[PDB]
Protein backbone atom coordinates (compact mmCIF):
# COMPACT_ATOMS: atom_id res chain seq x y z
CA UNK A 1 0.00 0.00 0.00
CA UNK A 2 2.98 2.31 0.45
CA UNK A 3 4.66 1.26 -2.80
CA UNK A 4 1.62 1.36 -5.09
CA UNK A 5 0.50 4.75 -3.75
CA UNK A 6 4.05 6.06 -4.13
CA UNK A 7 4.22 4.74 -7.71
CA UNK A 8 0.87 6.35 -8.56
CA UNK A 9 1.91 9.69 -7.02
CA UNK A 10 5.26 9.49 -8.84
CA UNK A 11 3.48 8.82 -12.14
CA UNK A 12 1.19 11.80 -11.49
CA UNK A 13 4.07 14.14 -10.60
CA UNK A 14 6.07 12.92 -13.61
CA UNK A 15 3.18 13.41 -16.04
CA UNK A 16 2.49 16.83 -14.50
CA UNK A 17 5.72 18.27 -15.95
CA UNK A 18 6.91 15.69 -18.49
CA UNK A 19 6.98 17.50 -21.85
CA UNK A 20 7.56 21.06 -20.57
CA UNK A 21 10.68 20.13 -18.60
CA UNK A 22 11.88 18.23 -21.69
CA UNK A 23 11.41 21.34 -23.84
CA UNK A 24 13.15 23.46 -21.19
CA UNK A 25 16.12 21.07 -21.04
CA UNK A 26 16.22 21.11 -24.84
CA UNK A 27 16.29 24.92 -24.85
CA UNK A 28 18.88 25.01 -22.02
CA UNK A 29 21.61 23.21 -23.99
CA UNK A 30 24.28 25.87 -23.42
CA UNK A 31 24.03 26.89 -19.77
CA UNK A 32 22.72 24.01 -17.68
CA UNK A 33 25.37 24.43 -14.97
CA UNK A 34 27.62 26.94 -16.73
CA UNK A 35 29.38 29.16 -14.14
CA UNK A 36 28.18 32.50 -15.50
CA UNK A 37 24.37 32.21 -15.68
CA UNK A 38 21.47 30.77 -13.70
CA UNK A 39 18.34 29.29 -15.26
CA UNK A 40 14.90 30.49 -14.18
CA UNK A 41 12.42 28.46 -16.26
CA UNK A 42 8.74 29.32 -15.89
CA UNK A 43 6.04 27.12 -17.39
CA UNK A 44 3.73 30.11 -17.44
CA UNK A 45 0.53 31.48 -18.98
CA UNK A 46 -0.22 32.87 -22.46
CA UNK A 47 1.39 35.78 -24.29
CA UNK A 48 2.21 38.09 -21.40
CA UNK A 49 5.78 37.48 -22.65
CA UNK A 50 6.06 41.24 -23.20
CA UNK A 51 5.30 41.77 -19.50
CA UNK A 52 8.13 39.36 -18.67
CA UNK A 53 10.25 41.05 -21.35
CA UNK A 54 9.81 44.26 -19.37
CA UNK A 55 11.65 42.58 -16.49
CA UNK A 56 14.11 41.08 -18.99
CA UNK A 57 14.87 44.61 -20.21
CA UNK A 58 15.16 45.54 -16.54
CA UNK A 59 17.87 42.89 -16.70
CA UNK A 60 20.52 42.95 -19.44
CA UNK A 61 19.19 43.11 -23.00
CA UNK A 62 22.26 41.63 -24.73
CA UNK A 63 22.08 38.94 -22.04
CA UNK A 64 19.11 37.17 -20.38
CA UNK A 65 18.00 34.68 -23.00
CA UNK A 66 14.34 34.62 -21.96
CA UNK A 67 11.72 33.06 -24.22
CA UNK A 68 8.95 30.46 -24.36
CA UNK A 69 9.87 27.74 -26.84
CA UNK A 70 6.95 25.31 -27.14
CA UNK A 71 4.39 23.17 -25.24
CA UNK A 72 2.32 26.34 -24.86
CA UNK A 73 -0.18 24.87 -22.39
CA UNK A 74 2.45 26.02 -19.99
CA UNK A 75 4.63 28.27 -22.14
CA UNK A 76 8.18 27.44 -21.08
CA UNK A 77 9.58 30.93 -20.62
CA UNK A 78 13.15 30.10 -19.65
CA UNK A 79 15.44 32.97 -18.64
CA UNK A 80 19.24 32.81 -18.35
CA UNK A 81 21.40 35.83 -17.51
CA UNK A 82 23.76 35.71 -14.54
CA UNK A 83 23.86 34.73 -10.88
CA UNK A 84 23.05 37.91 -8.93
CA UNK A 85 21.63 39.89 -11.85
CA UNK A 86 19.50 36.87 -12.70
CA UNK A 87 18.45 36.68 -9.03
CA UNK A 88 17.27 40.30 -9.18
CA UNK A 89 15.68 39.62 -12.58
CA UNK A 90 13.81 36.58 -11.24
CA UNK A 91 12.58 38.69 -8.32
CA UNK A 92 11.39 41.39 -10.74
CA UNK A 93 9.81 38.78 -13.03
CA UNK A 94 7.96 37.25 -10.08
CA UNK A 95 6.85 40.81 -9.29
CA UNK A 96 5.54 40.90 -12.86
CA UNK A 97 4.36 37.30 -12.35
CA UNK A 98 6.73 34.39 -12.93
CA UNK A 99 7.90 31.31 -11.06
CA UNK A 100 11.01 29.15 -11.34
CA UNK A 101 9.97 25.51 -11.69
CA UNK A 102 10.66 24.17 -8.19
CA UNK A 103 8.93 20.79 -8.29
CA UNK A 104 9.04 18.25 -5.45
CA UNK A 105 11.10 15.09 -5.05
CA UNK A 106 14.10 15.29 -7.37
CA UNK A 107 12.62 16.61 -10.64
CA UNK A 108 12.59 20.07 -9.10
CA UNK A 109 15.64 19.28 -6.99
CA UNK A 110 18.28 18.01 -9.46
CA UNK A 111 19.85 19.19 -12.73
CA UNK A 112 17.14 19.42 -15.38
CA UNK A 113 18.73 16.92 -17.78
CA UNK A 114 19.12 14.31 -15.04
CA UNK A 115 15.69 15.30 -13.69
CA UNK A 116 14.20 14.75 -17.15
CA UNK A 117 15.97 11.40 -17.50
CA UNK A 118 14.73 10.24 -14.09
CA UNK A 119 11.22 11.51 -14.86
CA UNK A 120 11.22 9.68 -18.20
CA UNK A 121 12.38 6.49 -16.45
CA UNK A 122 9.68 6.90 -13.79
CA UNK A 123 6.96 7.56 -16.38
CA UNK A 124 8.10 4.52 -18.37
CA UNK A 125 8.25 2.22 -15.34
CA UNK A 126 5.30 3.40 -13.19
CA UNK A 127 2.50 1.96 -15.38
CA UNK A 128 3.74 -1.62 -15.33
CA UNK A 129 4.75 -1.20 -11.68
CA UNK A 130 1.26 -0.01 -10.71
CA UNK A 131 -0.34 -2.85 -12.69
CA UNK A 132 1.90 -5.47 -11.06
CA UNK A 133 1.32 -3.92 -7.63
CA UNK A 134 -2.45 -4.03 -8.16
CA UNK A 135 -2.16 -7.66 -9.30
CA UNK A 136 -0.02 -8.54 -6.27
CA UNK A 137 -2.45 -6.77 -3.93
CA UNK A 138 -5.42 -8.58 -5.51
CA UNK A 139 -3.67 -11.95 -5.25
CA UNK A 140 -2.65 -11.25 -1.64
CA UNK A 141 -6.24 -10.29 -0.80
CA UNK A 142 -7.65 -13.39 -2.52
CA UNK A 143 -5.07 -15.58 -0.75
CA UNK A 144 -5.10 -14.05 2.76
CA UNK A 145 -8.53 -12.50 3.43
CA UNK A 146 -10.02 -15.81 4.64
CA UNK A 147 -7.33 -16.33 7.29
CA UNK A 148 -7.52 -12.62 8.15
CA UNK A 149 -11.29 -12.86 8.63
CA UNK A 150 -11.01 -16.03 10.72
CA UNK A 151 -8.36 -14.37 12.89
CA UNK A 152 -10.54 -11.25 13.12
CA UNK A 153 -13.56 -13.30 14.21
CA UNK A 154 -11.47 -15.13 16.83
CA UNK A 155 -10.01 -11.81 18.00
CA UNK A 156 -13.49 -10.27 18.22
CA UNK A 157 -14.61 -13.28 20.28
CA UNK A 158 -11.59 -13.06 22.59
CA UNK A 159 -11.97 -9.29 22.99
CA UNK A 160 -15.67 -9.71 23.74
CA UNK A 161 -14.78 -12.30 26.39
CA UNK A 162 -12.19 -9.88 27.78
CA UNK A 163 -14.74 -7.05 27.92
CA UNK A 164 -17.25 -9.39 29.56
CA UNK A 165 -14.69 -10.41 32.19
CA UNK A 166 -14.51 -6.78 33.35
CA UNK A 167 -18.25 -6.69 34.14
CA UNK A 168 -18.12 -9.48 36.73
CA UNK A 169 -18.37 -9.31 40.53
CA UNK A 170 -15.93 -11.30 42.63
CA UNK A 171 -16.38 -12.84 46.05
CA UNK A 172 -12.79 -12.83 47.40
CA UNK A 173 -11.54 -15.94 45.56
CA UNK A 174 -15.15 -16.52 44.61
CA UNK A 175 -17.38 -15.12 41.90
CA UNK A 176 -21.09 -14.45 41.51
CA UNK A 177 -23.12 -12.82 38.76
CA UNK A 178 -26.66 -12.17 37.58
CA UNK A 179 -28.23 -12.29 34.14
CA UNK A 180 -31.48 -12.58 32.22
CA UNK A 181 -32.44 -15.43 29.89
CA UNK A 182 -35.77 -16.49 28.41
CA UNK A 183 -37.91 -19.17 30.00
CA UNK A 184 -38.38 -20.62 26.52
CA UNK A 185 -34.57 -20.63 26.27
CA UNK A 186 -34.23 -22.09 29.79
CA UNK A 187 -33.79 -25.61 28.34
CA UNK A 188 -30.69 -24.87 26.26
CA UNK A 189 -29.34 -22.65 29.05
CA UNK A 190 -29.86 -25.47 31.55
CA UNK A 191 -28.17 -27.88 29.14
CA UNK A 192 -25.21 -25.50 28.97
CA UNK A 193 -25.25 -25.16 32.76
CA UNK A 194 -25.09 -28.94 33.05
CA UNK A 195 -22.35 -28.80 30.39
CA UNK A 196 -20.28 -26.73 32.84
CA UNK A 197 -17.53 -28.35 34.88
CA UNK A 198 -19.63 -28.41 38.06
CA UNK A 199 -23.27 -27.77 37.08
CA UNK A 200 -22.90 -24.79 39.43
CA UNK B 1 25.06 36.42 -23.70
CA UNK B 2 26.32 39.78 -22.43
CA UNK B 3 26.82 38.41 -18.92
CA UNK B 4 28.58 35.29 -20.20
CA UNK B 5 30.77 37.55 -22.36
CA UNK B 6 31.59 39.76 -19.37
CA UNK B 7 32.42 36.66 -17.32
CA UNK B 8 34.66 35.40 -20.15
CA UNK B 9 36.47 38.76 -20.24
CA UNK B 10 36.94 38.54 -16.46
CA UNK B 11 38.22 34.96 -16.87
CA UNK B 12 40.77 36.19 -19.42
CA UNK B 13 41.85 38.93 -16.99
CA UNK B 14 42.20 36.32 -14.24
CA UNK B 15 44.24 34.08 -16.56
CA UNK B 16 46.57 37.00 -17.32
CA UNK B 17 46.88 37.73 -13.59
CA UNK B 18 47.69 34.06 -12.94
CA UNK B 19 50.38 34.03 -15.64
CA UNK B 20 51.88 37.23 -14.20
CA UNK B 21 51.85 35.75 -10.68
CA UNK B 22 53.55 32.57 -11.93
CA UNK B 23 56.22 34.62 -13.72
CA UNK B 24 56.85 36.79 -10.63
CA UNK B 25 57.06 33.70 -8.41
CA UNK B 26 59.58 32.08 -10.78
CA UNK B 27 61.66 35.29 -10.83
CA UNK B 28 61.69 35.60 -7.03
CA UNK B 29 62.54 31.89 -6.69
CA UNK B 30 65.47 32.20 -9.11
CA UNK B 31 66.70 35.31 -7.26
CA UNK B 32 66.53 33.54 -3.88
CA UNK B 33 68.29 30.46 -5.30
CA UNK B 34 71.08 32.62 -6.75
CA UNK B 35 71.51 34.48 -3.44
CA UNK B 36 71.59 31.22 -1.45
CA UNK B 37 74.13 29.62 -3.81
CA UNK B 38 76.32 32.75 -3.70
CA UNK B 39 76.29 32.86 0.11
CA UNK B 40 77.01 29.12 0.36
CA UNK B 41 79.90 29.24 -2.13
CA UNK B 42 81.38 32.29 -0.38
CA UNK B 43 81.12 30.59 3.02
CA UNK B 44 82.70 27.37 1.72
CA UNK B 45 85.58 29.17 -0.02
CA UNK B 46 86.25 31.35 3.04
CA UNK B 47 86.19 28.27 5.28
CA UNK B 48 88.65 26.45 3.01
CA UNK B 49 90.97 29.48 2.95
CA UNK B 50 90.77 29.91 6.74
CA UNK B 51 91.47 26.22 7.34
CA UNK B 52 94.46 26.42 4.98
CA UNK B 53 95.77 29.50 6.81
CA UNK B 54 95.37 27.93 10.26
CA UNK B 55 97.01 24.68 9.13
CA UNK B 56 99.89 26.62 7.57
CA UNK B 57 100.28 28.57 10.83
CA UNK B 58 100.40 25.39 12.93
CA UNK B 59 102.80 23.75 10.45
CA UNK B 60 105.11 26.78 10.51
CA UNK B 61 105.02 26.75 14.31
CA UNK B 62 105.97 23.06 14.26
CA UNK C 1 20.22 29.41 -25.44
CA UNK C 2 22.67 26.76 -26.64
CA UNK C 3 25.42 27.92 -28.98
CA UNK C 4 26.61 31.20 -27.43
CA UNK C 5 26.49 29.97 -23.82
CA UNK C 6 28.15 26.61 -24.52
CA UNK C 7 30.82 28.18 -26.76
CA UNK C 8 31.67 30.98 -24.30
CA UNK C 9 31.94 28.51 -21.40
CA UNK C 10 34.12 26.17 -23.48
CA UNK C 11 36.34 29.08 -24.57
CA UNK C 12 36.79 30.27 -20.98
CA UNK C 13 37.58 26.70 -19.89
CA UNK C 14 40.16 26.34 -22.67
CA UNK C 15 41.73 29.67 -21.66
CA UNK C 16 41.92 28.50 -18.04
CA UNK C 17 43.51 25.19 -19.09
CA UNK C 18 46.08 27.00 -21.24
CA UNK C 19 46.87 29.36 -18.35
CA UNK C 20 47.34 26.38 -16.01
CA UNK C 21 49.64 24.73 -18.57
CA UNK C 22 51.70 27.93 -18.92
CA UNK C 23 51.96 28.30 -15.14
CA UNK C 24 53.10 24.67 -14.84
CA UNK C 25 55.68 25.25 -17.58
CA UNK C 26 57.02 28.32 -15.76
CA UNK C 27 57.12 26.38 -12.47
CA UNK C 28 59.03 23.53 -14.15
CA UNK C 29 61.45 26.08 -15.65
CA UNK C 30 62.08 27.65 -12.23
CA UNK C 31 62.57 24.22 -10.64
CA UNK C 32 65.04 23.13 -13.33
CA UNK C 33 66.90 26.45 -12.96
CA UNK C 34 67.16 25.96 -9.19
CA UNK C 35 68.37 22.37 -9.73
CA UNK C 36 71.04 23.51 -12.21
CA UNK C 37 72.14 26.29 -9.84
CA UNK C 38 72.40 23.84 -6.93
CA UNK C 39 74.39 21.35 -9.04
From TrEMBL, chain A:
<comment type="similarity">
    <text>Belongs to the V-ATPase 116 kDa subunit family.</text>
</comment>
<feature type="coiled-coil region">
    <location>
        <begin position="1"/>
        <end position="24"/>
    </location>
</feature>
<feature type="domain" description="V-type ATP synthase subunit I N-terminal">
    <location>
        <begin position="15"/>
        <end position="103"/>
    </location>
</feature>
<protein>
    <submittedName>
        <fullName>V-type ATP synthase subunit I</fullName>
    </submittedName>
</protein>
UniProtKB/TrEMBL annotation, chain C:
<feature type="coiled-coil region">
    <location>
        <begin position="2"/>
        <end position="39"/>
    </location>
</feature>
<protein>
    <submittedName>
        <fullName>V-type ATP synthase, subunit (VAPC-THERM)</fullName>
    </submittedName>
</protein>
